[PDB]
């Protein structure tokens, strides 16, 4: 497998939703859009179960590719959720 591989998470609301902080992600940012992990908040699922870490990148929101979505669109679509979390991520840097 390549290091920066694309994977999907299937999770849901436990303590709360994610527990993660974001950096950049505006008009364009990473690639053809894209949002980037700043760091993990040690209060939620991302820490607890172990799914996302620093410098990981997001792609799709519940199947759908966010081609050219702004920071406001990315943030709004994160908070206007409810229970379930389906997303696709691209791995950032190498863990091991």
């Amino acid at each position: 497998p390549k290091p920066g591989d694309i994977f999907e998470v299937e999770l849901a609301k436990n303590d709360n939703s994610l527990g993660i902080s974001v950096t950049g992600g505006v008009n364009t940012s990473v690639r053809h859009g894209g949002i980037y992990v700043k760091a993990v908040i040690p209060q939620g699922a991302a820490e607890s179960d172990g799914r996302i870490h620093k410098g990981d990148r997001v792609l799709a929101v519940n199947g759908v590719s966010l081609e050219g979505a702004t920071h406001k669109q990315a943030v709004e679509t994160l908070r206007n959720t409810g229970q379930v979390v389906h997303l696709l991520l691209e791995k950032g840097q190498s863990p091991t």
């Binding site: 939703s17 920071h71 908070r79």
Partner: peptide, 15 residues
């Protein structure tokens, strides 16, 4: 003034 062109919404988020 407002309701038109640009507001301030390009900083940092968490969820």
């Amino acid at each position: 003034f407002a309701d038109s062109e640009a507001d301030e919404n390009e900083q940092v988020s968490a969820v």
